[PDB]
Every structure is written in C-alpha cells, then in structure tokens.
Design a protein around this nucleic acid. Sequence first.
RNA 1: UUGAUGUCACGGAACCUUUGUUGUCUUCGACAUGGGUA
Lengths: 1249, 734
Amino acid sequence: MTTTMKISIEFLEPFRMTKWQESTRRNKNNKEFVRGQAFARWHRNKKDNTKGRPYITGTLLRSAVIRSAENLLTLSDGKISEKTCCPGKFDTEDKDRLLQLRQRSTLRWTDKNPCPDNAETYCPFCELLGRSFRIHFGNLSLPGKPDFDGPKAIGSQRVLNRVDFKSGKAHDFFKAYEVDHTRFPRFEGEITIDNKVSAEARKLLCDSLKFTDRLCGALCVIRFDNLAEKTAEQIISILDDNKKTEYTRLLADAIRSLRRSSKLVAGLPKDHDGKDDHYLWDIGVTIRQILTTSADTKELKNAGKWREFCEKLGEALYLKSKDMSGGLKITRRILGDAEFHGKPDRLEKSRSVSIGSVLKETVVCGELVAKTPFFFGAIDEDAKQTDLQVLLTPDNKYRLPRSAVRGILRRDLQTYFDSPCNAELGGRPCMCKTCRIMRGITVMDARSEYNAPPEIRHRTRINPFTGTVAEGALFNMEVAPEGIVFPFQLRYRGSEDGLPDALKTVLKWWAEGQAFMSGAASTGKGRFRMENAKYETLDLSDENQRNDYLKNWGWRDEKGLEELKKRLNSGLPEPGNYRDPKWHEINVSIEMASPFINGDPIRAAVDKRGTDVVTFVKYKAEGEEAKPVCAYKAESFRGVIRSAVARIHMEDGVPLTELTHSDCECLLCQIFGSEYEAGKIRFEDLVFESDPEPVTFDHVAIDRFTGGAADKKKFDDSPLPGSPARPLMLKGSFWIRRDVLEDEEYCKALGKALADVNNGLYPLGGKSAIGYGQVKSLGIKGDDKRISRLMNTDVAVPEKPKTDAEVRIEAEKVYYPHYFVEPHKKVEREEKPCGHQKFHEGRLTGKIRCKLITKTPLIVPDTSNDDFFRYHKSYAFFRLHKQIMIPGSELRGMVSSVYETVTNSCFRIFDETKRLSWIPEKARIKYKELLRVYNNNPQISRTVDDRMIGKRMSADLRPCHGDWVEDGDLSALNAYPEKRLLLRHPKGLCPACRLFGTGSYKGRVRFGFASLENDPEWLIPGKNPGDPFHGGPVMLSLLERPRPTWSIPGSDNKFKVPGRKFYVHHHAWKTIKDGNHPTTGKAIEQSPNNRTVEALAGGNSFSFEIAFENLKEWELGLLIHSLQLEKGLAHKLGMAKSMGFGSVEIDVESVRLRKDWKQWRNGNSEIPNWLGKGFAKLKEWFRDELDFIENLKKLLWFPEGDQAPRVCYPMLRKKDDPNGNSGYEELKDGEFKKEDRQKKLTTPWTPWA
Amino acid sequence: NPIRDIQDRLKTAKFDNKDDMMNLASSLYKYEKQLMDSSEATLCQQGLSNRPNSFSQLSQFRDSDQTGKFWQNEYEACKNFQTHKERRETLEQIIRFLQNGAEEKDADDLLLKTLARAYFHRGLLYRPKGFSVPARKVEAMKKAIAYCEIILDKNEEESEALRIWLYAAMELRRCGEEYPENFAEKLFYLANDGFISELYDIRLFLEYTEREEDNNFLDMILQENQDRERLFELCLYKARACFHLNQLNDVRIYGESAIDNAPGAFADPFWDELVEFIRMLRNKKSELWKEIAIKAWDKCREKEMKVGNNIYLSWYWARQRELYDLAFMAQDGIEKKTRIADSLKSRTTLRIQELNELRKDAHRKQNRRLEDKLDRIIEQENEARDGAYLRRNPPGKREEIPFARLPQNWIAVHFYLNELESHEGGKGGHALIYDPQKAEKDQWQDKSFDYKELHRKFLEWQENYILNEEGSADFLVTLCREIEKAMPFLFKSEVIPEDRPVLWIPHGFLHRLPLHAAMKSSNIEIFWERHASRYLPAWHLFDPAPYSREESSTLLKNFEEYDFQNLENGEIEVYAPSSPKKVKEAIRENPAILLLLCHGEADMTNPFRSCLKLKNKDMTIFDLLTVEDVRLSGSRILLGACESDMVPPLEFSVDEHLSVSGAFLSHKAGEIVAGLWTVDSEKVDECYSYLVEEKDFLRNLQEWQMAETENFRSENDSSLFYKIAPFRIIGFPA
RNA sequence: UUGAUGUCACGGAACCUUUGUUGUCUUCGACAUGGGUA
Ligand SMILES: [Zn+2]
Ligand SMILES: [Zn+2]
Ligand SMILES: [Zn+2]
Ligand SMILES: [Zn+2]
C-alpha cells in the first residue's frame, strides 16, 4: 500500500525551456541535449507536427530536494528529531549507465562512514535517497493539459552571449526559450510514499520542499496539500500607377512612425498655400483619405490594433521597396554565428568539504532610475525593417534582464579585485574571489509600468574626402526613454558577517550613479542610479529564526515581501576598504552666437508644420507620460570630436583619416575603440540651458540669366534662434577612464583637438555654410587641469586702389535699368578638387573681418508676417530677438555672383528644362505643352521652340552637375548607379564650383550673420516720435517676373543667351520716397498687387565674418578682390534693385591666419602679395582677352556728385506718357530691331531715349 | 580611373561579342565597389563624353544583361598578398559582397564555389582566444560544408566541390568536432574519380588507402619530385607510404630527413601530423617510433626565448606534453630520461595575448632588445597558420650541466608525472634517484608509484583550506599520510642511506606539497628526523657559489597588523616605511641578510603581472627581473608571506608557476626561505630570529623542527603541526 | 511525459565599430487675343 501527496509549483519569474529532439539523439554524447537538462521540456502529441504541451520531469525536483536536504542537514549538524544521519553514498561502479555525474563538492557534517550496502534499517537521509520505490517523484504538468500549435505559441527564443573582460567583445553565445509566468504561472504533480517511511524522513522531505527556492532557472514556491494586406496593396498599386516609386521607403518610415497615436493622422502637414496638395500624402482616392478611413474604422479604433496595423503596413512597404535596387546588395549583419555549449567532464574527482554551521542571509531592496536612455539588444528574425531592436515583454513593457544584471555585477567585481578570471565552461567549480562571491548571490527580473512605443534614431557615416554622407551608409536603432524606474532586489546567502567589502564598494558605486548597465555605452546609453536602498541581516543558524524562515518561505512572494519591507532598515553599510571608481566625469559648456539645427527627415515629414527641415527632439518619461525636449545628439558630438582628433595626427606619414582602421592599433583606435576592442571615452547628449522655441526662415534660388526666382523648391528650415546679445548656452558631460587621463600622450591629443574645436574651426550641426552653428567658446571642468592646459602685431590694412572705369553720363537721355555681361568661351575645369582629409601644406586657413556701409536705402523684408502695418501686403526689416540683422545667405549669393563673373565660371544656377515660345514625338510634346500656356496665364498661335533653353547656350557654360536635356528619358536607369555619370561634365569642376561646393562636394567658405553697429536711421519717421527703433511705411510700385523673350527675340538658331543680368546704380528712389511714379510721374495708388515695406537710410554700418580653409594664394587673392572691388564701385543687395534701392559697399579690415594648432598670426602684411598672384593667374588663362572684366566694372560704377542719370523702363505706347518718351510698341520697329536687340543690351550704359 | 576605363570600354562595344560584355560588366562592378568603400577615388567628379551614344549603349546593355567571374578574379587577386591582415580584410569584403548573391535561389556553381572557398579560408585564418578552438571557425567550416552539400545535391562529380568538402571535413576532424555524414562515401567517390599530384590532396589519398586497404596510389606518391619548397611534407608522406609498403629502411631515412628539416612555429600542421604519425606507429607495434620520437624531442626542445638570467620563455603548444611523454617512454637510459624530464622544469609558456601584453610592458619600459624579438615571434606565429594552404615556408641551445657536480655527501631525487602512462592504466609517477658513492654502472634507480589518490586528497585539502582557512589541519595530516603511503620507498634505508641530505626537484603539483614532512604510521616518526632537505625549481639552475663577506642586515616591512619584537628591537636595521625606491636601493646595496615581510596579489592569466603590495605602489615581479646594477651574489634572503600569497590555485596536476623565489634566483641569490601556505606571525618571528642568530640555515631549520616537533608529539596536536609544517629552503650555495 | 546511491546551468552582459551631412540672394517690365484686311 502507498499514500499519495499532491504537489503544486508556482513560478515568480519567467522560466527557460529546451527544444524537442529525437529519441536517437537523446543520449549522453549530444552536447545540446546535455546542456538543456536543467530546463523544462516540450512534449509532442505526434512527432510529425509540433502540437503539444510542456512539462517538467521529477528527476530535477528530486535533485533539488536532495540539495536542500543536504543544506538543512549541515545547518542542523546532522539531526532531524533524535537520529543522526550518515553522509550518504554517491559512488557507482558502473558509471557508463549514468547520463550525468556530479561535479560540485559534497557537503560534510560527520566523520562516520555510510551505512552497509545490505541492512535492515537506514538513516532518514539514506531513505530519502532511496537505498532500500520508497519515495517516487511524478511529472509536473499543466492543469487540464491544454494543447498549443507549437513552442513559439507560448514563448520566444533569445540569444545569450559571453563577453570577454580584457577586450570587451563577445565571441560566442547560446540560445534558449523563455516563457512568461503571467500566462503560465503554475504546474501540478504528485509524490508517492511506500507507507513505511519514518516520520523523521517525512519531516526532512517537507523541510527540504519548503527550503527549495528555485527551479528551471526561475524563483518558485512549492506548496503541498486582416485589412493591413489590402491597404498595403492599394497603396503599392497607387504608387506604381502614379510612377512615384522612389518614395516607398520614406512612406513606409512615416507610416511606421505614426504608430505612436491615432491623433497624428488628423494633423498631417499641408503645402505652403495651406490646401491638401502635399507632395507625399496626396500622391493619389489618396493616401491621406486611406489612412483617415483606416483610423476611422471601429476595429482599428483600439490603440493596440492601431499599433500592430501601423507596424504591419511599415513592414510590408519596406519589403516591397527592398527589391527595387539594381546594383550590389551589401549586408551589414554578418559573421556572428558562434554558437557554443559547455562540455561537463565525466572523469572529475570526487571531493567533500565542510563549510560550517554559520549562515546568514542579507536582503537588499531599492529602485533603479534610468538617468539616460538604455538599449538591451534583442533582435527578432521576422521583423526586418529595423536593424537594432530592444527587448520587451509580451504585453509591450520594458524589461531589465537578470542575465544582464548578473553580468554587470561580475564585471564590477572583477574591476574591484583587479584580477580577471580565466575559467572555462565545464569541470569543477572555479575557486577565485569573484566566483566565490557570485555563487551566493540572487537577483530578480523586473519590468516597468511605462509601455509606450520605442523611439528610433537614425545614424549615418561621413566620407572624410568629399565631406558628404557616404554612399549607402544609413541605419536606425530603437532606444528606450529615460526616467523609467525598475524595482530592485538582491539576496546574498553566505557565512560572512554582513556583506563582503567588495559588494559594499560596488553597491556604493551604483548608489553614486555609476551603474553603466546596458549596451551601446560608447554613445552614453544606459546609466542608472540606485536610490531608496534598504537592508537587513537574517541569521539562519538560530533555531527560531530558521523555523520562521521555513514557515514563511523566506518572504519571496509579494504577501511576504510586504512584511519584509516593513521589517527592513533604511540606509546602507559603508565599506571598510573603499576603492575609487574607474571612470571620471568631465563637464562641458558651449556658448553659441548663431542659429542651430540638427536635421531629421522623418519628423520633418510627420510634423504638422510644413517645414522641410526640423530639429531633433527626445522624450523623457515623466511618470507614465512624455515630454519632448530639444538636444544635440551624442553620436554627432562624438563624430565631430573624433574627426577633430584624427585630422591633426599622422601615422608613418599617413593621416589617420585615410587608414582603414580594421584590425588597427593607432592612437585613434586606442582612444575611441574599434571593431576588435572597446572605447575608453563615453559621450552623452547635450541640452540647452533654456526652453527656446524654433523660428522659421525661408529662402529662394535666383536664376543667373533671367534674374528672377528659378522654378525650384521654395525651402525653409526651423533652427533654434541665437544672437550675439542672446547666445545659446549648451551644457552636458562626458566620461573618461582613469588610464587615459593618466596617459600624457592621450591627454595631449585630446587637448590639441579641444583647442582646435574651441578656436572656431569645427562647426556643430548642419547648414554651416550660411553661418549656422558658430561656436563662440568652449571650456571644460573636473580634470585637475590636465587637459585644459592646452586650451589657451596689428598693422593697418592697405586701402583700396582707385578705379579706372570711365563712363559718360548725359543729363538729357534716359537709360535702361539692366544690361548683360557676355562671358568668355573658355572655362578652366579640373577633375580632382582638393580633399578635406587634412590641412594641406602651402594653403592658408584663417578668418576675414568685413565692414559693410550703406549708400542707398536698403530693404531686406521679414516675410514671417505679411500684414505688419494693418489684399495689400506689408513687411518689416529683418529682426531677430529685437535686433536688426542681415542673413548670411544674401551676402553669400551676392559675393558668389561677382566671383563667378570675375573668374568666368559656369552658370551656377540655371533653369535648363524651360521651353520658350512666341506625327513624330517632337510634334506631340510641343502640342501638349501648348495647352497649359493657354489655360494658365495672368493676362495665329505660339511658335514653340523645338529645343529646350539649355541647348541655346554653349555647352561649356552650362552647370557642371546639371539636368538632362538631350532626347530620351533617364527614368529607365533609376535603379542602376550609372545614371549620375550621364549628368556630370566630362572635364570636372570650374573655379566657382570648386570654392563654393556643389551637391556632391563640400565648399570651403562660410558666411556669418551681420549685425548693425549703431542706432538705426530710418528713411521715414515712425508713428511714435519717442520710438527710434521703428520706421514708417513706404509704398512701392508694381513688381513682376522677368521676360526671357526680350533678350531672345526669335526662334532662329543665331539667337542665344547673352550673359548674366546686372543692375545699375541710380537715384530713382527719391521719387519713390514721394508718391510719384518712377516714369509716368503720377501718384502711386494702393492696390493688392504692390507692397509696403520698411526701409533704412544711408550711413548705417554692419559687420560680419568669413571663414576659409585650404585656399591657394591666387584663390584668396581673387576672393578679397571680389569683396573690396575699387574706390568708386558698389554692390547691389536686398529688394527692388531696379528702383535704385539697395547699393552697399564692403571694406576689409583684418585678416588672421593659422600656423599650427596653438599659434595664430596676423596676415595683414601679405594682402598685396595675394592680390598680385591673383591677377597673374588670370593672365595665363586669358593673355589679352580680358573684356568681360572691364564691362563688369562699368556696370558697378557708382555715380558721383554733379550727376543724376534718369533710369526707368519704357511704357508700352506713346499715348501713355506725360514726358513724350518712346514706347515698347514703337521701339521694336525702331532702333531696337530683332536683328540688333542683343547688341544694344550687351553694351553697358546706353540710352534708349 | 574607373570612369576612364568605362569610357574606353564603351568606345569599343559589340552587342554580339562576349568579351566586351564581360569587360564592361567588370568595369561597372569595379566602379560600384569603389563607390561602396570610401576610398580616395571618390574625389573624381567627371562624367562620360558623347552623352547620347553612351546613354543608348548603357540602356541596351542593361536591357540585355558575370558576377561570379569578377569575384573569382578578386579571390585569386587576394590569394597572393604578403600580410595576413590584408588577406583577412579582403576575405571579409569578398564574403560580405557575395552573401546576398549566393543566397539568391538561382545561384551559379562558380559563385557558390567562390563563396565556399572564401568561407574556408576565413575559417582557416581565425586566431585563438583561450584554451579551446573558437566557435566561429567551426561555424565557418560548417557553412562551407553546407554550400558544398547544396552544390552536390544537384551535380554529382564536381572535383573542386568534392575537394573543398573533404578539406572542410578533415579540418573539422582536426578540431574537436567529429566527422560529418557520408564522409566515407564521398572519400570513396573521389578515390574512384582519379589521382591528383598535390601535397594537399596526398593527405586525402593517404587516408583513403589507409581506410580501404588499396595501395595502388602509393607508387605515384613515392615517385614524386623533390623540387618544391615544403620538402618535409613530401618526406613525411613518403615515409607513411613506405611504411604501408614495409620499406622500413626508407621509412627511417625519410624520418631523419623530415625531423632535420622542420619549420619553427608550431601553428603549422606538420607538427600535429608528425605526432599523429608517431602515435600510429606506436599503436601498430613497429619498433622505430622510439628513435623518431627521440629525434623529434631533440629538435623540439631548442625553441625557447631567454628573458632574464636563469629564466626562459616559450609559446604554448597543446601536444608538447604528449610528445615529451612519448620521448620519455621511448628513452631507455636513466640519465637520458632524467635529462628529458629536466627539459620541462623552470619554463614559462604563454599565449598570444600574454605575449602582446608583455611586449606592451617592455615598450613602456624601453627594452628594444626584447621588444624586437617578441615582435618577431608574434609575427612568425601569426603568419605561419595558412602556410600549408598557401604553399609557403618562412624560415638556440643551452649548455648542459654534468650530473657529477654533486658533492660526495648528498643525494639527488628527481620526479616526473607521465600523464599518458597514467591514462593507460599504469603507474604514471616516476622517482629517479642518484648516489655519488656507488659503482659507476649502479649509480641510478627508477621507482614508480601512483598519484591519483594523492591528487584527490590534495584537491580536497586545497578546497577546505580556501574555504575555512585553519579548519583543515586534519586534512593536511591525511595528505601527509597519503604521501607516505603512496611513496613508501623513502623509509627503507637501502635506497636513501642514513645521514645523507636529500635534494628534491619536484615536477607538477608536487612543488606545493611538504615532501620533507611525510608522516609514517601511537609511534609516529617524521621524515626530517633522519635527513635534511633542499629544493630547486630545476636541475639546470645548479650553480654553487660562496657567501658574502661584509656584515650587514636590512628589513623591509609593510605589515601593520603585527609588530615583530625580536626582528624590530634587535640587531638588524629596521625600515618600516619601505617604498619601491628604498627596496631598489636595498637590492643594489648587496647586504648579507635581507628580509621582506609584505603582501602580494597573484595573477592567473599573466604570471609576470603578480604584484608586491608596497606603500602606494605595486611592484610586479617583471619589474624585479628588469633592474640594472643588481648585486646579490652570495647573499641570503628570508622572504615573508608574499611568496605564499601570490601563488594561484592549481588546476592541472602538471602546471607550474613563477614567483619571487624564482625572481631572486635569477639574481643569483645564495638562499631563499619561504613557506608553502599562510604562515603565522609569532612562529615567523621565532624562526627568523633563530635563523639570523645562527649562521648555517640547514642546521637551524633541522634543530628548530626537532625542538617544536617534540612539543607537537607530546600531545598529538594537528593544529600545531599545521603551523610547524610550512617551512623550506630553496637554493644550494657552496 | 521522467527513473532513481551522483544535474555548481543564478557556470555565460547580444557585446563591439559609423557626424542626417552636402548645394540654393524671397528675387522681379513686356505684352496678352485670333485672326484683321482681301
Ligand atoms: Zn546513511
Ligand atoms: Zn573564477
Ligand atoms: Zn586605427
Ligand atoms: Zn561649375
């Protein structure tokens, strides 16, 4: 007869499981099977399919109970009630029949030999072992025995690596399943007894069952008593039909990013006008309508349904778009498979040790607060859209794995002890300090209440040569937010009085805020801090305390943890032998006196504002909410600092920027890490010391021939504003190891790099060509003056020479506002421009201080508000933080035009596709483009030209990197990479494109903002006499687009582009100051077609900065000439140039050069040399064919005193002038004939009346 | 430039010819790869002339249309570089570019073969990390076998595919992994096919004939030419073939040729093949493995690096111990066996990482004479890996001390643990004794014993001592009883006569045992009651010298827990604030008696990184070795607790470690006194006071041991015997 | 759905390397219509 006993086990954590294997492979020679012995098992209903349920074998429970019984017996000195216990028997003559042997050291509590092999009585321990079935352990199965399709229906597989200590990289790993305890929390079985077991043995069994604390890798308590496919298909069909197949990836990214909330669909951006005509969301029904109805549907109303729907659409679109490539397909995730399992030896020696009767358990409880974003890598093989992914629970909650926590504890203990452990898997246990301490530690698995979707950041790689992004270098990474709090618990069972000193020191390090616990630590990810720590000690050697512990199960369920936390004490023990941390914090303060931007196209497309470029923002977890804040990316900061370090150092004569750095041991690799090593410096994000909102700036591209705005994307950006009076303060910190700080060479390298960055040579952020991201100063603190040590004549400039231009101005004749400058027919191109990888010898790097002075009322309108003075529009002068300013883009364009004309470069900006006007494929396209002329105009048939405007000029003078104007469509070769070579020039880049850059090459000149240096002098007094900072309004006349048909009369082949348009200087603004018309003399009346502006007067003075690098002597000589032209010449700037407004003059006042990383020199005593070298270079290119130079000087000749030329456009007819001048109608059949028009318009300062 | 080449190819293009299409595709792929990697060629900013014609030709070519041929040519371009780093990075690039193309379902045989060969070569190029082969290597071979298997699923008799499959299988067998499936059947398909004249297929043919008993190919194998660079491979294969043909004289001659002409680095597979051949000959009962093994050991023993006097360095090899086990069993003369055993003692073997670390330390210490040799060794070992596959073969001794130098009133005892013999079920232990006052023919004896139980008891005692420290005196007593029971010949009085001090030279774990404190089974007698004792790490350190002349003393202490009464308030000078500077001054002072009572910390990875804990500084033993102008000849040193502190736990029974004892032996120190485990402060004070009070050290130690063992035996106190036990003397002055 | 005198798997951190960068003046004067006439 027998007696049964029900058993139930309830896990408090997820438990691991092993995969199914065939009975033939189920043997002792299979490494995978041997390794997967301590986990659960999967049972298949039939071996054809994977349908089945999991279970746990009774042998594992028997082994755990035996271990617990041994622990209890050594605690109790070998007594249960009244009977002493022999040490048992663990010796077998036939070892080959045992699947697994024992490697650990058996516990010892007595000196008596085991019982005889054949005897009529046995001790309770021997009876429990089964040396006389006495105790039979059954299998544990789920209640009711349900069936699931497979193992993946209840859990997911995860990779678990081993990290080398000295280097910091993992070389092998293994895989296992994981089942969450929330869904599968309990199992049940039975234990049978042979009805002859002693009461002492039964008591020992019960105590061991209560003492057993974990099983299957988890803590336990044992008690005995489908529209996504359709929508994707519709979107793909619409995109294919509309031929917009190049936006598939961007659309997929946007649709994926919409998963945060369904309210984002209602606030999608619109075009500039404000109607629903976006370039992305209105391609078609339309994509906007499709998304609207999808969000409208009741079944997608739920948030989780919407989230999975968005993820599915993103994945489907990504897979659809992936196959459109037509070149080599690279793969970055490669050569990582290094699966490895331990090999337990079978010839291990048997040992026995006595640990003693003293045992204490120390409980520690607290929290873990995330101070920075963290990343726990866990990539799913099915989700291919994102490269790097984070670990989440089935209910979409963040997780803090016990494996990671234990690994970080082991690493910190090794760091404290200063003794790496070289133990290997298999064999008897290691017996070093770290392993001994870690054998008695227990840690729990935590999770957070916050369950928002992760935020994803994009990363790229920069080509050090061309200065642009590398080709096919783009990847993205999921990042969890900051401010999440995880519960923390830690138990240490050991014989020491309290915790060890090493553990105390490590806990103190964690408390001080140095718990670097997660991956991607180079970019400042995963810094935690322990707070609200509590601790206590429990003495298990005492009889009453041991009985209470056994009765209460050690307080591991929540119902016992609640009372334990009440019993806990607040504080933490101080260590005896404290050792300082291995990392040091360096504070960073940056002052910026200009705008700032950090682009993000995904947010640019998703945000409600229709701006093309937006700044990066990150979210912070405030409880269970989010709060965006503007910041600067640690990745970008690290890249800038690394480039600064690399560009000034060489290895065996080779700059470090040129090396491959794969399997390298250079200074850069040793400092910043490599693929085979880990870095020694960690950068974190920087946050501004305020909450400034973004502003909006808009731009436009000017055609060089017509002089109007080219038909380009009118673009705008959203930088964070800055000013000299209100700079931007940026703060943060970075961490550095102690050995690097001790190394003098590394300190010197970092100091040199930081000094160069502080001197103003490395801007931060994008769009730096127009003065964005100019660092005013940089300083650091908290280094004991070891890196900041290295971060530490004015002759009068020559005056300009007098001009030689000579122009005769009669006081009877009327002139024409603008004339064309015909260029030379020779452009000096070069295939290979200078590189950006170093500071080349023989070239100059420095700064230029300019000084602009006004000579005529200047107008630079502020287009943010078009109704300033009250349909009729109004504008005000450009201001920023209540400070009058001139943007750098205007000055850049103004200087670039003159430089291009001087050097005889290509037409930098041009509209090649425009077709003028006055069966084969040629005839039909001419007919299709004719109807839009009729159907769209503000005001016998047209004479459509048979060739585009790009074919009407010399091929040498066209833009270097232009458009396709020849017959045939390049749309066929969209996928193939050879398309670009059919657009570039065969000979290289002209001098203008070399200096100012192009789409595939970075420029070498940067223009800063300009600030007014005095109280303004307005043209008209303002409304308030007491307010001198605001001016009055002035009404201008009508403004209209240019007409290219005036300069190109007929369609005959002898008519070509005449040259570059330029405006002359005159004093017609006097009549505009009054109400009179420039030409008719009548009063100007208000109308919705004209505008009102606020204008300055003459005498105002501005000042700005120009920075240059790697410029030859002749290049710098011509640049200075283009600024300070002559004594008697002037530029044109601003708006309404035709009416006389906006003539300025620039005066250079200082030039500073760079000699080395520390010493700068004043270069004012070398301007004559550079000017001479510049003119010599022009002579060799053009010996005596220099006529475009003098024609330019004629147009820029500012009239002196005792001269008042009359300049104005003609009227249409002789019947509409009080002055009786000529008109356009009679001028055409007059002196301005079709066969003589181009000659007249090319001669500067020629009269028409 | 790539653009210029593309223009040249486009100028002369025929849409019916093939070579133009292959050339155009190759140029386009070259340009695209150059765009992929951020090279200096990206600075070119030109286009293609004759735009309409070029566009038409490009459109027609792309509408009409190999990758495999281009990547093959890239592979043979990679296969003749000079630097393993260049080869490795190029192979990474090739594999990364070929992944997706091979993963495409309609992949071609050339493409798959190229990828498989690239995987095999990259697997061959992997470097070691620790005590076991990397897993990435094994996964690379598995990938190569998978690619060959998918090729062979469709096609049947691909020669190159079958050869690559067999190469991968043989390399897997060379690693720990066992053979794949169908190995015999494939080896049988290639045997039936034909006979190739290649060194790197002769191994496969040798395996086939040795398996299936077919000696047809042996004639062709033996009739190969002798106008190659890897002559040793031909010699070894010819020896194997002649052994199959019973031409034993030719086998012998090829044996001496192969042993005489051998490479330097052990990374070459030639050494492993030689060891396998020797083991096969021994198993097959052919009595010439003895001579082959003796010659192989004689050639192999000379590869070592000399750092510091009386200290040598070597690079780790797995089968060196087995080869030294095979030579020891082969040898017959007792003196020659003693020499073979002594060839292993007092030697340090390190790995690539340890060599790199010590090179970095030498660079920081400005030692060109050592850094250059380390770089030579490292680059040789790195480069000598794939020499067999790539058909390349890049290119001292020490004096022997006669055994007659021992005095007339001493006995020498050597030890050696034969792991292979023990694994064979025999008695692995060997005690080799020598006796100066006997006949010249009968001056040597060979005694054998078993050490498994002794090793088990030592491990148990070590675990207990690490756990509870002083609660293992009974375990130490059991260990001593086990020593006496396992080596009973020490107490027979016919092997070791009375009034004859013994000189122990242990090997393996026997260094950390108190052989001078063996207890014989309440009448108990101790070993030291009959004879004195000395120790030496190895026999080749034997160099008697006189003592010093000047009289002085020096004490260097960093021990605040205990104040040594007699040592401090006595005759010797006291320097409580002992810094590294004063330590160096003391070593350079050449005193008569020197003491060093400080702490230390071991290092399990790098033995040279073990530190002595001084005031605000840590002085490694390597720093002690590299000191200029050291004068310690004929001087005694009493040491302290640091020597026992900085000893790592033992893992393998045949392991050895260097310590401050060896460091001071390198300085020709007269004598060293130190304990085996943690000594007691008061006993240290008493013993060192007696030692400095009298002059002779052996007599002092014997008298002290008798004086305190009387008190021990008066009550049978194991706890006291634990304190008496750890004391020994190292060295042999005049 | 385990087998029994022998399971340190809480014996192993998915770790390590890559600047969303580059190019652009918020600029501005000649017509519009189909036929007219015969
Ligand atoms: Zn018993
Ligand atoms: Zn360890
Ligand atoms: Zn490098
Ligand atoms: Zn150009």
